[PDB]
Amino acid sequence: CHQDMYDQQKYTTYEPSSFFADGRSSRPNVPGTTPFEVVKTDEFLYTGLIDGQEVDAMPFPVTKDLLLRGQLKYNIYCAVCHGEAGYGASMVAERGGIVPANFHQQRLREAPLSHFFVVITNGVYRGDPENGGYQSMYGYASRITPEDRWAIAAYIRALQLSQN
Amino acid sequence: AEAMTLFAVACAGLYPILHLGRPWLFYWLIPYPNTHGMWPQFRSALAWDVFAISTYATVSLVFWLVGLIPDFATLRDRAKNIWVKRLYGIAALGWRGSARHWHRYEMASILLAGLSTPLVV
Amino acid sequence: QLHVNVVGIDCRYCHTSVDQSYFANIPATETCMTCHSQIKTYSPLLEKVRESYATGKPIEWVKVYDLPNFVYFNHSIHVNKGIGCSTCHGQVNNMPVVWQQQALYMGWCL
Amino acid sequence: PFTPQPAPVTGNTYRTYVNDARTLLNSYGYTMEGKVHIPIDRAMDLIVERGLPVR
Amino acid sequence: FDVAMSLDPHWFSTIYGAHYMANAGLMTLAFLALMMSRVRDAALFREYVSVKPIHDIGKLIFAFTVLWTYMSYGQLVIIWSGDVAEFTPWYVHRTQHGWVFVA
Amino acid sequence: CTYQPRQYIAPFDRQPEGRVPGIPQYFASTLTLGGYGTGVLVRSNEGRPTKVEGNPRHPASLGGTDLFAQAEILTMYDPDRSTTVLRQGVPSTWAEFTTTLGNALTAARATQGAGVRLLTTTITSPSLAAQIEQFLQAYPQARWYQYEPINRDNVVAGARLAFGRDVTTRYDLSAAQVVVSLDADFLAPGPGFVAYARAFAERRKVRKDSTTMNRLYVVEASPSTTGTAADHRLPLRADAIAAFTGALANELGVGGAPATLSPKAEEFLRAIARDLEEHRGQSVVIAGDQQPPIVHALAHLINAELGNVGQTVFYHEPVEARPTNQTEELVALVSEMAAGRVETLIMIGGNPVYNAPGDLRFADRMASVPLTIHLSQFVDETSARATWHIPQAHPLESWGDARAFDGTASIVQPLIEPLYGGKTANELLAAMLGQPEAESYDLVRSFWLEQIGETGWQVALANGVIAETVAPVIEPTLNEGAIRATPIPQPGDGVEIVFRPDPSLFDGFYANNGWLQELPRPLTKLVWDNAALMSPRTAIKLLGLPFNADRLIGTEADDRERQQYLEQLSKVNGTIARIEYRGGIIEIPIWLLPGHAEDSITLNLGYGRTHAGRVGNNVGIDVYPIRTSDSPWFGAGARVTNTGRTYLLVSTQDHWTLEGRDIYRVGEFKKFKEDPKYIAKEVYQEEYGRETPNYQSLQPGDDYTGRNAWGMTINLNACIGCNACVVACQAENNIAVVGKDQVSRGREMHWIRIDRYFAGEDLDNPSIYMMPVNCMQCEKAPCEVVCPVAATVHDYEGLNNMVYNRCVGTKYCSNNCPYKVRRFNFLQYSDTTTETFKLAFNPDVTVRIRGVMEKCTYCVQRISGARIAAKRAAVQAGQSSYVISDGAIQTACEQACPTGAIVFGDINDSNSRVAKWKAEGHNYGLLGFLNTVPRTTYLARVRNPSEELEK
Ligand SMILES: CCCCCCCCCCCCCCCC(=O)OC[C@H](COP(=O)(O)OCCN)OC(=O)CCCCCCCCCCCCC
Ligand code: HEC
Ligand code: HEC
Ligand code: HEC
Ligand code: HEC
Ligand code: SF4
Ligand code: SF4
Ligand code: SF4
Ligand code: F3S
């Protein structure tokens, strides 16, 4: 039973490390650091705001493959805890009284696309400083790529049309 | 001389394991059932060494023991101690040297000697 | 069993990097808290989770499927080439406690 | 160590919601508040045909 | 070495010559057995001989046949396993144009 | 008992936004060797830097990198880096220093800052320069006083003599058919080294279509990498080069002075002059930094006469902030310290006590100064004698900006938050300017914003360069009278001493780094040690060794006898010689260098450090005390008595000549143009009597006709023996660093090795040949056939596969390998107890344990990743193509080489670069008489000799 190279000295992806304070060899992103050949110049792609306001516009044209990718991403992440059809009827809501929002309500029909992008990026609303406050939607910035987030917004538009 | 051969082979059999660098993995050269499905190469000459030395040691030991079986019978008869007897006697295997035991013994010794000459070369 | 078979959550919601890299992303406490900030809050069996996400300390899961760091497996190519975590892992959908379905022998892979 | 046999899940599960929603997403129909449904993949085709504003 | 190995100066074998001695020994022993059958009746080969000399010559022929095979195999394995361009041609010539069938 | 331990797994609490787990990322940052920035692309496995590469869009780093940039990873992970602020060697806090600094500066505000003094190195960062200028504005009487041991003082001095203004000289080697080098190493690491190496190599690379090749003439005291890649080399004494330059100007007709010279030197002068005037505007003259300012002024004058200016030599506005004579500024500071005028000294790095010349006695004068503050990144000898030592952030973990020799203004980007904290130089300047607790990111961003704009900052981070900033081209006016009216000092005062920066350790900053110390030094192959380098004749006369030294000289007929005599002449290496220069004795062991000039000794700086980390704590003999301010790079008189007492010096090669074997092929260019295969057609006529060798094999092999096949071509003409590839392999494949004792026992572990063969007539002036050797990936491999457990087997592509887990350690494979490229772990070389070293190891490659063999794996991890990616793309498309691009896979050695000698690609794809190179007439494989059929092949060296010097 050699156990020779079974556990090597190198640090793998999630191997715990005693060298760091928080016990993680994996490190958080240094602030203000951009990967190589990844320019962040376009504001629309990374934020639905053009002047601090929503636009009801989408940075790149809608494509059938784009809508299919949006449908896939919606089914993986968005469908649970909000309904596959967008009516908010999900098994999560039953066990917990989540009460997710309904896409087909008139308010979300007139909401801009960039509003959907903002909601997916950050959440419904951060808690009020006074009297407490909790984040319900809770945001999905890290898990989903911006282009995928725009595809999800396009799929939400398609879903809203589907019931009209 | 044959005792010298056995002891020299015993001394020389340690070096293939000692020089191995990872000495506890000597069994890898020998074909053995494993969950990996790996085999020795059999085209290198160290794989041949494993079969030659192992065959040489076993054949030399069996030939030496066969020669000692009649000698053990004389020792058990002259042992003069009940405990010393029954130790040579089990090794003798009740030799009871007799015709129809010698005839097979002589033929077997000639055959073993005939097989050993190509083996040592 | 509860989250997949009853609550109905996709595999890629938690193991998000399975089809893109060699590593199936073990969920962060962020994904745990997106439901349990409201559901089953103030529960003694979700205390460790709530202990995280307040301090930076991680949750030390015990690795069930372990390879001896000279094997270099890749989920991405496998999944993309038409192989799923049922002929490759087991019915994890109905697994209250995950167990190793088979020993990862060299012969099994071959 | 014999392979464990976990106890089956309870009566209520997510499958009913998903199946009902997947049935609703196609086969047209009439919603209560509005007029008419549109099958999924048909509304998506309509969305590409009319397009969305850019920039 | 002078009579046969020098036919192709590019190739040399150290075991060569020892192989010829084994080949010569087998040929002479086989020749002696053929002659003995012819001279089995000769009077001095009648009151002074027994099966034991014939048996010993037969054992010697068997030993020489195995010895010649060992020397020939030993040269082949060393040249084949050590694939050096210098010693490869002799085997290539003896395995081509139907020479393989003779081997 | 169980197969393995629990192996707990710890995940994140909040996922990084742009990171996919298990997928490495690449970030653009800048690494500076002489204060001049070189753009680098660094792989971040999981938020930790692991592999440095080159930035294709950065001028002076087009893919290629120098060894110093490669070996920065192990420096960032040195377990001896400073971790805390020390008041007087006792741990303290940054806040306490900030309070003290503020009190000291407000106590110096009564005066105008007359006591406050600075001491930095060559600073090219615009942010730091602006902050220093603002600080000087706040304190009128403060002084900057830059200094660093390896500086460009002579270059700016010659510029201010020729033009009356500091300019920046740039060389465009792509359009120079003739290049002349007066003791200048442009192919050795320095400003613009990668850019110069790539342009020079491209001209040298010759195919059947090519009709033109560049020619290099080099005059130098010590043989060097630039000398190796030269058609003609003259070993003149270092002092004589100034006289040689004056003579060259005189025969060209430009102002100079006739100088008496040796007949060989006069013949070299005639050839150089005749080659010039035949290539006007197609020639360049380069003068080394070591050479005196008059040599630089003459070089500008010669270039102007030939009209080369504007075609091969370009003048730009100075890029190094304020250019100055650094040695004179340090002399001014030491006199002020002796007087006691200085009350505060702040030093940003540079290790002044160790680096400063011995005559200055900086350490004794440093004691007089009441407060001395040092930012070093290590507790150096200066920090030990300095109050308030402050840890400095490593460039990889710090926010910063730097300028290249051309002028680029590239931005340094942190890949990790500082491991032990520490403060950047700009943060120290901010505290002096009265703003404490100022973030490095804000300081650099604030300066850059409004100059390039926020959008420019985003583009600058994504790329490795700032497009807006470059040095403007200016046309200076040459002052004929000043250059003509110069002394031009004559050479000759007895034995001379030449001071050269160490090839692997530079100025001694990299002495702690294990990879660089273990690296064999090019042309001397020494490891972990410093030796005096002298020609065989110099050693015989000075140390009284009993050898004729004329026996080495001879024709081709007695070449084998002369090679044996050189081996007998060796074994005297390591005799200790006591050398007295100017009141200083070094007692350094001597190593014989055949190409060295007579009556000259080369001593390498960067050794003998006492406060360095556990690695290189006390290695070699310090040459800094003997070195003098008046003559930093040259020496006039040395006693060089022999004390016997031989000391062991360890070298990797152990043999200096090829024993009449076809290892290196050398041919003329004119013959090559008529027939590319002439070099291969020859040799076979001497050996077999026929142009083509009819090799015959009894073993079939595998077809490989329709599958990807991986092969490498190395160009002998391009290689300069830099050794960057060896460092790149060590970082990429996690090769262990063995100790000096293990190297002495010949157990060094290097997958790639460079061999110097020193084969020529005379052998006192031999032609150095550098050949990179790595596993040849032989289609029929002897090592595979002798392996009992089948650890080494072939691959479908054609790659030899070495499986460490299968290897039982028999060592039969190394014995049957003809090229001896296999390295075995006799003892546990890998470091298991050091956390920082564990972070450095690359996850893709396994860390080998004791008892397993290692060999070059053609960077299999890169090939496997490309194969998986190509298959994944094909299945998603549905094509099932599995097509891999020619540029998709680049080996670490291929990326590292500045010249571009190493090319890796599919052999079967006839459009690939390797396929085209392998179809050349001068391509060949080593030891063809063995039917190994290697895949790594070499291109025979083609030279371009002038008919004057040669015929
Ligand atoms: C093609 C033609 C054949 C050419 C053959 C050439 C090679 C022949 C080699 C023979 C070597 C013999 C060495 C001499 C041995 C010896 O002295 O003989 C002693 C005996 C016993 O006879 P006793 O009692 O002394 O007197 C007889 C008269 N009354 O005879 C023996 O041969 C047995 C002794 C042991 C044999 C030793 C030789 C073994 C050689 C092995 C190496 C072979 C290399 C491949
Ligand atoms: C869809 C049915 C799947 C499949 C096939 C797997 N998961 Fe998960 N998983 C989650 C967490 C937090 C863990 C670690 C805790 C634990 O192991 O009990 C896991 C673990 C696994 C494993 C084993 C990991 C190992 O180291 O071997 C496997 C093979 C696995 N999962 C497959 C989280 C979730 C999750 C909620 C976010 C859901 C949904 C899934 N996993 C779904 C699946
Ligand atoms: C991140 C990997 C986690 C972890 C560690 C857990 N969950 Fe969930 N969870 C969800 C729902 C709807 C339930 C049941 C609600 C109910 O029982 O009333 C749960 C339950 C759990 C438990 C059991 C708690 C208990 O029995 O009291 C545990 C230990 C648990 N979870 C751990 C919903 C989600 C969800 C989607 C909204 C996601 C994502 C998670 N849970 C994630 C996690
Ligand atoms: C359970 C964790 C949810 C997941 C999964 C998704 N959403 Fe959600 N969403 C959730 C809640 C509880 C609410 C209502 C919050 C409230 O204060 O009422 C929402 C709301 C939205 C909205 C409306 C936002 C608004 O300002 O009105 C949108 C547009 C929305 N959710 C979209 C959305 C998408 C795209 C999701 C997949 C990425 C998604 N939700 C998942 C809870 C949850
Ligand atoms: C081939 C059999 C598969 C397939 C198709 C999937 N899994 Fe994975 N899995 C498998 C092995 C051999 C391992 C061990 C990896 C190691 O380094 O030891 C794993 C591991 C996981 C893990 C643990 C986290 C990790 O190793 O990255 C998770 C989580 C996991 N597998 C999940 C998973 C998912 C969601 C899959 C998609 C259906 C999946 N596996 C497929 C073997 C295989
Ligand atoms: S170069 Fe040596 S190790 Fe590499 S394949 Fe050839 S014989 Fe084997
Ligand atoms: S190909 Fe890779 S392993 Fe081989 S020498 Fe180059 S860097 Fe080292
Ligand atoms: S092959 Fe290696 S030593 Fe030669 S020039 Fe390239 S990097 Fe330098
Ligand atoms: S012979 Fe084989 S066992 Fe290892 S040391 Fe060589 S690969």
mmCIF file of C-alpha atoms in Angstrom, chain F residues 831-949:
data_model
loop_
_atom_site.group_PDB
_atom_site.id
_atom_site.type_symbol
_atom_site.label_atom_id
_atom_site.label_comp_id
_atom_site.label_asym_id
_atom_site.label_seq_id
_atom_site.Cartn_x
_atom_site.Cartn_y
_atom_site.Cartn_z
ATOM 1 C CA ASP F 831 10.360 19.810 -1.472
ATOM 2 C CA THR F 832 7.390 18.591 0.640
ATOM 3 C CA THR F 833 7.763 20.700 3.841
ATOM 4 C CA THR F 834 7.680 24.216 2.267
ATOM 5 C CA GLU F 835 4.147 25.679 1.799
ATOM 6 C CA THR F 836 5.329 28.449 -0.600
ATOM 7 C CA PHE F 837 7.108 25.919 -2.904
ATOM 8 C CA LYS F 838 3.940 23.727 -2.854
ATOM 9 C CA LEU F 839 1.915 26.756 -4.124
ATOM 10 C CA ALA F 840 4.488 27.229 -6.960
ATOM 11 C CA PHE F 841 4.097 23.650 -8.344
ATOM 12 C CA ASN F 842 1.864 23.488 -11.485
ATOM 13 C CA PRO F 843 -1.290 21.300 -10.948
ATOM 14 C CA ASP F 844 -1.264 19.838 -14.534
ATOM 15 C CA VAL F 845 2.114 17.999 -14.049
ATOM 16 C CA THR F 846 2.661 15.423 -11.215
ATOM 17 C CA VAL F 847 5.396 16.085 -8.584
ATOM 18 C CA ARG F 848 7.637 12.968 -8.926
ATOM 19 C CA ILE F 849 8.723 10.971 -5.805
ATOM 20 C CA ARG F 850 12.095 9.158 -5.214
ATOM 21 C CA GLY F 851 12.747 6.063 -7.402
ATOM 22 C CA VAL F 852 11.050 7.239 -10.653
ATOM 23 C CA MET F 853 12.784 8.274 -13.953
ATOM 24 C CA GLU F 854 11.874 11.591 -15.721
ATOM 25 C CA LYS F 855 12.347 12.727 -19.386
ATOM 26 C CA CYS F 856 11.069 15.481 -21.761
ATOM 27 C CA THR F 857 7.325 14.849 -22.415
ATOM 28 C CA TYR F 858 6.890 17.392 -25.286
ATOM 29 C CA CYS F 859 4.768 19.318 -22.702
ATOM 30 C CA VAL F 860 2.081 16.535 -22.823
ATOM 31 C CA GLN F 861 -0.216 18.605 -20.542
ATOM 32 C CA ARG F 862 -0.488 21.261 -23.327
ATOM 33 C CA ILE F 863 -1.043 18.554 -26.036
ATOM 34 C CA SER F 864 -3.736 16.766 -23.938
ATOM 35 C CA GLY F 865 -5.569 20.061 -23.270
ATOM 36 C CA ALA F 866 -5.553 20.938 -27.000
ATOM 37 C CA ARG F 867 -6.751 17.405 -27.962
ATOM 38 C CA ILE F 868 -9.632 17.553 -25.399
ATOM 39 C CA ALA F 869 -10.596 21.092 -26.554
ATOM 40 C CA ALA F 870 -10.538 20.124 -30.280
ATOM 41 C CA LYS F 871 -12.699 17.010 -29.622
ATOM 42 C CA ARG F 872 -15.170 19.044 -27.489
ATOM 43 C CA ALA F 873 -15.509 21.716 -30.222
ATOM 44 C CA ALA F 874 -15.995 19.059 -32.947
ATOM 45 C CA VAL F 875 -18.793 17.205 -31.045
ATOM 46 C CA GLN F 876 -20.650 20.485 -30.246
ATOM 47 C CA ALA F 877 -20.425 21.434 -33.967
ATOM 48 C CA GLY F 878 -21.341 17.815 -34.885
ATOM 49 C CA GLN F 879 -18.485 17.773 -37.449
ATOM 50 C CA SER F 880 -16.451 15.024 -35.620
ATOM 51 C CA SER F 881 -13.409 16.698 -37.316
ATOM 52 C CA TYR F 882 -10.996 16.698 -34.306
ATOM 53 C CA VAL F 883 -8.789 19.286 -36.125
ATOM 54 C CA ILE F 884 -5.907 20.925 -34.139
ATOM 55 C CA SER F 885 -4.481 24.279 -35.417
ATOM 56 C CA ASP F 886 -0.714 24.690 -36.134
ATOM 57 C CA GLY F 887 -0.340 27.466 -33.504
ATOM 58 C CA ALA F 888 -2.724 25.847 -30.975
ATOM 59 C CA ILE F 889 0.062 23.921 -29.149
ATOM 60 C CA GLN F 890 3.302 25.746 -28.195
ATOM 61 C CA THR F 891 5.809 24.021 -25.835
ATOM 62 C CA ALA F 892 7.163 26.073 -22.881
ATOM 63 C CA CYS F 893 10.697 26.051 -24.405
ATOM 64 C CA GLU F 894 9.282 27.187 -27.807
ATOM 65 C CA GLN F 895 7.450 30.174 -26.218
ATOM 66 C CA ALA F 896 10.463 31.108 -24.014
ATOM 67 C CA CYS F 897 13.097 31.221 -26.806
ATOM 68 C CA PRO F 898 13.659 34.889 -27.860
ATOM 69 C CA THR F 899 15.383 33.827 -31.148
ATOM 70 C CA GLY F 900 12.615 31.385 -32.212
ATOM 71 C CA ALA F 901 15.013 28.436 -32.806
ATOM 72 C CA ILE F 902 12.579 25.805 -31.371
ATOM 73 C CA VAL F 903 9.472 25.030 -33.546
ATOM 74 C CA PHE F 904 6.820 22.436 -32.451
ATOM 75 C CA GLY F 905 3.991 21.266 -34.771
ATOM 76 C CA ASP F 906 2.269 18.346 -36.580
ATOM 77 C CA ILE F 907 4.735 16.540 -38.944
ATOM 78 C CA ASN F 908 2.004 15.034 -41.150
ATOM 79 C CA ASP F 909 0.303 18.354 -41.900
ATOM 80 C CA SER F 910 2.518 19.530 -44.759
ATOM 81 C CA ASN F 911 1.418 23.154 -44.312
ATOM 82 C CA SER F 912 2.701 23.351 -40.726
ATOM 83 C CA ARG F 913 5.900 25.251 -39.985
ATOM 84 C CA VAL F 914 7.633 22.117 -38.686
ATOM 85 C CA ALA F 915 6.744 20.211 -41.851
ATOM 86 C CA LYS F 916 8.231 22.973 -44.005
ATOM 87 C CA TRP F 917 11.359 23.166 -41.838
ATOM 88 C CA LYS F 918 11.862 19.383 -41.877
ATOM 89 C CA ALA F 919 11.785 19.438 -45.693
ATOM 90 C CA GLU F 920 14.893 21.639 -45.707
ATOM 91 C CA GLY F 921 18.074 20.176 -47.150
ATOM 92 C CA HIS F 922 20.171 20.743 -44.019
ATOM 93 C CA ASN F 923 17.773 19.053 -41.575
ATOM 94 C CA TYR F 924 19.197 15.971 -39.852
ATOM 95 C CA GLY F 925 18.805 13.729 -36.814
ATOM 96 C CA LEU F 926 21.465 12.965 -34.225
ATOM 97 C CA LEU F 927 23.228 9.581 -34.365
ATOM 98 C CA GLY F 928 21.586 8.316 -37.529
ATOM 99 C CA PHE F 929 23.620 5.100 -37.563
ATOM 100 C CA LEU F 930 21.320 3.961 -34.767
ATOM 101 C CA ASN F 931 17.920 3.188 -36.253
ATOM 102 C CA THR F 932 16.041 5.243 -33.661
ATOM 103 C CA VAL F 933 14.364 7.587 -36.189
ATOM 104 C CA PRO F 934 14.089 10.654 -33.924
ATOM 105 C CA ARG F 935 11.326 13.219 -34.275
ATOM 106 C CA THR F 936 13.324 16.091 -32.770
ATOM 107 C CA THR F 937 15.656 17.195 -35.556
ATOM 108 C CA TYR F 938 18.277 19.896 -36.020
ATOM 109 C CA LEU F 939 19.088 22.347 -38.798
ATOM 110 C CA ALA F 940 22.792 22.396 -39.639
ATOM 111 C CA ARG F 941 24.472 25.738 -38.844
ATOM 112 C CA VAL F 942 25.221 27.877 -41.943
ATOM 113 C CA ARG F 943 27.902 30.619 -41.535
ATOM 114 C CA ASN F 944 28.560 33.763 -43.677
ATOM 115 C CA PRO F 945 32.375 34.285 -43.735
ATOM 116 C CA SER F 946 33.999 37.371 -45.342
ATOM 117 C CA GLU F 947 36.559 36.390 -48.035
ATOM 118 C CA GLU F 948 39.035 38.946 -46.572
ATOM 119 C CA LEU F 949 39.362 37.421 -43.042
#
